[PDB]
Amino acid sequence: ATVLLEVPFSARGDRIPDAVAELRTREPIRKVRTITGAEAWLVSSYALCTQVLEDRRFSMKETAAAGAPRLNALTVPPEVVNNMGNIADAGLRKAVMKAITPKAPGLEQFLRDTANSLLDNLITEGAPADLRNDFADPLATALHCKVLGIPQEDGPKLFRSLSIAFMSSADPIPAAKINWDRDIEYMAGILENPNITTGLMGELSRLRKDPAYSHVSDELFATIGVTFFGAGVISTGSFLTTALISLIQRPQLRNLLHEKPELIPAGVEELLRINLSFADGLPRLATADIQVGDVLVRKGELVLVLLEGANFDPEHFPNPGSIELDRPNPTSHLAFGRGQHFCPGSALGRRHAQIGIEALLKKMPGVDLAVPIDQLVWRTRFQRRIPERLPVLW
Ligand code: HEM
């Protein structure tokens, strides 16, 4: 006798398990057990992943309901699961979206300058360099302080909440509440700080005093700051880090993008497609009985949308493990989700990665791992897959 198949399969972000293609071929929706002990439906084909993400009766909001089967424990207040819904209901969606595009004057130049400075510092210090802790994550942190309009010197502490805030835990995490409450207090202070007049927090500060938004809660305004910082920093830092591994392990591609940087956007789109940064499927709770492939999912059941299931599906992306810069459907991957909850930071995330990669290839054309790839230490029980350190030489 064996127990029900457990998720997640592996915390390694440098290879997809053979099990994924096996499940997708044999049982593209199948029952699994999560770290809390709950049962869930794991969905692993492109067709079924898109079906679930495009049907709001598979609800994000309802995953926070008391007594629901859970992927992992909440690390935010339950009302904050419906963050985007709350933002939209407050009439703030257009403003929040507009503030987090990469198109503000000087933003991309700021990204380039920051990437180049970080790289120059690594070159001065000499190999080996840690491209996660001393490149990708600081670049993400600096970007998000700029986007939010908050002081650069406040970035590192906000960042250090993240190794706990984005845990994927069976049980509630006391440190997550301590850091959440402190970070909310910080953002509430930012809204009251007369110096904060630019970026997302400058805009929210002004809308807060606009009579058209007088009944929006201060709680929501502060929450937008904490959640957008956290989601953007963890997602961009983690994606860039694992994309750098994918690139470093493909010297031919590394060389091609070095030689022809105009191909970097297409390269980043493929790096997004093959990215294993999300450690768990995207959770949804069924609010009705809904047929998904061979399974009638029942009201109240948990469904997990496995992004790499979709993104490595050979029926949608032939030769899925290969980076091909001339695919006919290149942005049709699910790296940013799909439907109601499609990532609002997608353009910014693309630009962060494109600029980071462009700068690294110019400064370190000979970049290579400084340790055998198996020596990377993969963070466990976390909402992202990331190596604790990424040692390189050049
Ligand atoms: C390459 C970098 C990024 C990746 C791969 C990524 C991925 C994703 C994915 C897959 C979702 C969908 C979650 C779901 O449907 O359950 C999502 C949602 C979200 N992302 Fe991103 N993201 C990235 C960058 C960013 C940035 C830069 C920000 C903000 C500055 C951001 C903020 C958010 C927020 C607030 C949501 C929730 C949307 C909702 O609930 O409607 N992300 N992201």
> What resolution in Å is listed for this PDB structure?
1.4
Task: Kindly list the distances between the CA atom of residue 38 and the CA atoms of 82, 136, 173, in Å, as whole numbers in the listed order.
Answer: 21, 35, 18
Alpha carbon 296 to chain centroid, angstroms: 30
Distances (CA, A) of 286 to 78, 88, 122, 211: 17, 22, 49, 38
Distance CA 392, CA 132 (A): 10
Beta bridge partners of 42: 30, 304
At residue 384, φ and ψ (nearest 5 deg) are -125, 155
The two structure tokens encoding residue 76: 């935010």
Q: For residue 196, what are its two tokens?
A: 């904060």
Method of determination used here: X-ray
Q: Of 115, 230, 170, 184, whose CA–CA distance to 380 is shortest?
A: 170
Neighbour count for residue 45 (Cβ, 10 Å): 21
Closest C-alpha among 5, 11, 13 to residue 29: 5
Helix residue ranges, H only, the chain: 18-26, 46-53, 83-89, 93-99, 107-125, 137-148, 155-160, 162-165, 174-191, 199-208, 218-248, 251-259, 264-273, 307-311, 346-363
**CA distances in angstroms from 269 to 121, 311, 383, listed in the order given:** 28, 12, 21
Handedness of CA 147, 169, 340, 81 (dihedral sign): negative
Lateral strand order in the sheet of 129-130: 129-130, 391-393, 368-369
Which DSSP string corresponds to 147-202? Answer: HHT--GGGHHHHHHTHHHHTB--SS--HHHHHHHHHHHHHHHHHHT-TT--SHHHH
Longest alpha-carbon distance in the chain:
65
DSSP symbol at 317: S
Nearest CA to 170 among 289, 64, 270, 38? 38
**Tokens representing residue 243 in the block:** 């994309």
Report DSSP letters for 210-228, one per residue.
SGGGTTS-HHHHHHHHHHH
Dihedral sign, CA of 86, 88, 94, 95?
negative
The residue extents of the domains of the chain are: 1-394
CA 344–ligand 1 middle distance (angstroms): 6
Kindly give, in sequence order, each residue whose CB lies less than 8 Å from that of residue 126, ignoring residues fewer than 6 positions away.
none
| Rg (alpha carbons) of the chain, rounded to whole number | 21
Q: Which fold has domain 1-394?
A: Cytochrome p450 (1.10.630)
Question: How far does the centroid of ligand 1 lie from the alpha carbon of residue 350, in Å?
Answer: 12
Asked whether the beta carbons of 33 and 9 are under 8 A apart, the reply is: no
Which of 343, 346, 383, 385 is the best mutation target for the ligand 1 pocket, counting ligand atoms within 8 Å of the beta carbon and taking the most?
343
Give the pocket of ligand 1 (CB within 6 Å): 60, 83-84, 100, 227-228, 231-232, 235-236, 239, 277, 282, 335-337, 341, 343-345, 348-349
| Amino acid letter for position 61 | K
Torsion on CA atoms 223, 89, 218, 73, rounded to nearest 10: -30
State the pairing for strand pair 282-286/302-305: antiparallel
Q: Is 27 exposed, middle or buried (0-12, 13-18, 19+ CB in 10 A)?
A: middle
Whose C-alpha lies nearest to ligand 1, atom 15? 341
